[PDB]
Design a binder for this molecule. Structure first.
Ligand SMILES: *[C@@H]1O[C@H](CO)[C@@H](O[C@@H]2O[C@H](CO)[C@@H](O)[C@H](O)[C@H]2NC(C)=O)[C@H](O)[C@H]1NC(C)=O
Ligand SMILES: *[C@@H]1O[C@H](CO)[C@@H](O)[C@H](O)[C@H]1NC(C)=O
Ligand SMILES: *[C@@H]1O[C@H](CO)[C@@H](O)[C@H](O)[C@H]1NC(C)=O
Lengths: 106, 232, 254, 228, 55
């Protein structure tokens, strides 16, 4: 009975809105502006690059979300980083899988 | 006389792309009359010894051979074997290298374990493990780099794979790094890379730091603003 | 006659299984109120287990008088066997944690007071359940004889894993209660609609975990697959004594 | 013809609770009049080979003997003599074993490590590792106990002592055990007993639990507002 | 000023125990800890107990 107004999956906000009606009486309807947010507590500033410090501040200006940088992964979008591998004097850079649990072919 | 044969390494094909492979004989007298014939079910050998390491601290002998064989041919599992042509040896020993068809393949679930609380309290060098669980029986090459800087392999040691106690098929391994206490105190992050098959690009990376090494402070500053807003 | 199949605290592990009512409200107070200080030998431990078996037998006898009694008593003996053996599922109950916390004292004392030709055999294990099962199998014959005083041969369902046995009580109970259900029609009709929906999803939830055909559970499943000519069946065909596989279970009212 | 004798190590002494000696003959098939005996360096026959082992068909004779009474004398380092005599050989063959001397006895320093959060989240199985390190002699026996009972040797796996790069005389090792996720969420205790020569008590225990690693503070500052 | 860490041994029948205090793997001097002799349990028939304190 609710419609998801904002569903930013890289911020995990899940703002909905519902109409719960008082029974057998005139209209004193109260409006639910539900909000649900799941903070990482262990993800970094770079969502992909792993050599960044942790992100503590969780600024949610909902004006921007209602109408850059973000902190929550998305399962369908695969992320990638490149590391240097050395077998000796030479080196070769090969990209990795930051989320290989859902990135291998299926 | 110590004799050993090394199949091509999984990190040699992926990185160098030149399928070097040889069988080695060491701790024996040098004669400089060795050309190891290789059998592809046929007697011909594509290449003889080049850059052979005759020099030894004990004046012993070594043999180096190289070739180039198709990857699909190795996947088929032909019984490539090397025959030594040393004049000292009266009977040429037969040493066969071939990976059998149907070997198990699985991806390494790499977890990185932070150092103990007790070791840091004692105020000496810490130790960080890089567990590798469930990977396929093929030998895996792992190395350690910090903030993208490849460290030298002199100060970390890796353990040969052993059968897993719970699963008779899969394997496991370990690797430890000894670093100064003040370095881990400063909070520098460290990374572990695995190089094994059954992965999208055959390389996986994990990392932690002091702020993620089983910490005690969760300094969260959840600062939601403009809650009312306008939306449709 | 409710099974309380919701998670709650009925079973700790996340898979859904429906606990039988016979497991709930048992007279386990004899082993519950044990004194590990006063008991340190095998002979004293047997007597209290026999007493508990007698109490269970008279409890079932009084409960029924408020072959079927024999079946319920059989599965109750199997349940008590599982309780003594230490492989029980109902870890969530706060009362049943204490029993498995204070039988460890008794069997640790027994393992401490053992001799060398058995010490080397029973040295290795976990939570002393190997010699616990050995003690049970040594003293299994006497316990059922004390139990059967109220109102032969040793029962065999005690070796059966508990989940399949729970399926067997479910089959017996449901056939019994559907026989109880029926034997103008507008008055009776609406209760049968509520009779189906109170246990409608009770069949489907367990069927999703019948796949992958515990450590000891799989070996019994593999061995029974070799026999009975029915390796993979959602219905066991053991003591069903009625039609099975959704034939008259659902929407039989119309 | 060749006879090989190997002395017991600390692991054998600790597990078997007795001293067992081997004076084993290789490349010698079954013949008559084969004499094996372990005698004191002073000369007396401390123990005979009662219940002699049957000869292996592939030219191998075990001929093991027990110096069970003299536990401390082996640790003293006194030399033992094995007397191998056969009709064909004119001069009796002798095997000599003794405890080595001069090696260092640095103590181990075990550090038991709890499983990672990533492994716990997948809810499959946790692996507790026991990083024994620092011991100078290369002999360590590690067992795992849960509620005062040694776990079966199938569940854990011990790696051989590997040389440590930072210091020449020291070594290290490790072992793992596959605990179920349920039995670790329940919060049980697991112990890693290490047996080594250099320990003054010759044994050390450590404990880990679900409560071993927990954060202390949770300072949260909810700063809800309406005007930016 | 001081602290008194105790060590409550209990439940043992054969009446002989050895209690020793180690700090950082090095045994403490015997002048610090004071061990009490075994005394029978009040509510247990044939199992003793003891104590040990450290300043
Ligand atoms: C930290 O974040 C920045 C952006 O906020 C990222 O920089 C680029 O990210 C894209 C994303 O795929 C990469 O393709 C580019 O290669 C990144 N730039 C560079 C110079 O590498 C990145 O995630 C982080 N920054 C850096 C320098 O890695
Ligand atoms: C904790 O957070 C506060 C406010 O964000 C900050 O002032 C303080 O420096 C932080 N302390 C640590 C140890 O992170
Ligand atoms: C915890 O956070 C508060 C602000 O929310 C900060 O003032 C305090 O310093 C933090 N604690 C520590 C130990 O830094």
């Amino acid at each position: 009975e609710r419609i998801v107004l904002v569903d930013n999956k890289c911020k995990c906000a899940r703002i909905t809105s519902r109409i719960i009606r008082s029974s057998e009486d005139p209209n004193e309807d109260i409006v639910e502006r539900n909000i649900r947010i799941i903070v990482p507590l262990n993800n970094r500033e770079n969502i992909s690059d792993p050599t960044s410090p942790l992100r503590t501040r969780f600024v949610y200006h909902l004006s921007d979300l209602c109408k850059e940088t973000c902190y929550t992964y998305d399962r369908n979008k695969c992320y990638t980083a490149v590391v240097p591998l050395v077998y000796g004097g030479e080196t070769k850079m090969v990209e990795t899988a930051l989320t290989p649990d859902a990135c291998y072919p299926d | 006389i110590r004799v050993f044969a090394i199949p091509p390494s999984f990190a040699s094909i992926f990185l160098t792309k030149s399928t070097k492979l040889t069988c080695l004989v060491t701790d024996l007298t040098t004669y400089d009359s060795v050309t190891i014939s290789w059998t592809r079910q046929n007697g011909e050998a594509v290449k003889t010894h080049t850059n052979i390491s005759e020099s030894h601290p004990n004046a012993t002998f070594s043999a180096v051979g190289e070739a180039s064989i198709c990857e699909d041919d190795w996947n088929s599992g032909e019984r490539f074997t090397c025959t030594v042509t040393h004049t000292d040896l009266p009977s040429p020993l037969k040493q066969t290298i071939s990976r059998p068809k149907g070997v198990a393949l699985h991806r390494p679930d790499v977890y990185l374990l932070p150092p103990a609380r007790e070791q840091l309290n004692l105020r000496e060098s810490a130790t960080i493990t890089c567990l590798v669980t469930g990977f396929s029986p093929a030998d895996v090459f792992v190395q350690w780099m910090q903030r993208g800087q490849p460290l030298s392999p002199e100060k970390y040691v890796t353990s040969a794979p052993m059968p897993e106690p719970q699963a008779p098929g899969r394997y496991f391994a370990h690797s430890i790094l000894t670093v100064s206490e003040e370095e881990w105190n400063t909070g520098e992050t460290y990374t572990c890379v695995v190089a094994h098959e059954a992965l999208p690009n055959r390389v996986t990376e994990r990392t932690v730091d002091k702020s993620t090494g089983k910490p005690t402070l969760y300094n969260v500053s959840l600062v939601m603003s403009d809650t009312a807003g306008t939306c449709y | 006659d409710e099974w309380d199949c919701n998670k709650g605290t009925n079973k700790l592990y996340e898979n859904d299984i429906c606990l039988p009512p016979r497991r709930k409200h048992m007279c386990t107070k004899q082993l519950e109120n044990i004194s590990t200080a006063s008991i340190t030998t095998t002979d004293d431990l047997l007597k209290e287990v026999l007493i508990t078996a007698v109490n269970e037998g008279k409890r079932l006898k009084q409960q029924w008088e408020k072959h079927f009694l024999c079946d319920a008593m059989k599965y109750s003996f199997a349940d008590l066997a599982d309780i003594i053996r230490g492989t029980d599922i109902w870890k969530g109950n706060r009362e049943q944690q204490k029993i498995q916390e204070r039988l460890v004292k008794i069997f640790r004392n027994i393992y401490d007071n053992l001799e060398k030709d058995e010490y080397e055999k029973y040295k290795y294990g976990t939570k002393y359940q190997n010699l616990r099962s050995a003690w049970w199998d040594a003293h299994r014959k006497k316990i059922w004889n004390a139990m059967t005083c109220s109102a032969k041969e040793p029962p065999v369902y005690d070796y059966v894993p508990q989940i399949l046995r729970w399926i067997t009580e479910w089959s017996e109970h449901f056939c019994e209660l559907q026989e109880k259900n029926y034997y103008t029609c507008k008055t009776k009709c609406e209760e049968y609609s509520k009779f189906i929906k109170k246990w409608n999803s009770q069949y489907i939830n367990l069927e999703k975990k019948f796949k992958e055909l515990d450590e000891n559970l799989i070996q019994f499943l593999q061995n029974v697959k070799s026999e009975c000519n029915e390796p993979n069946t959602v219905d066991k065909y053991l003591m069903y004594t009625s039609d099975c596989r959704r034939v008259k279970f659902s929407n039989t009212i119309d």
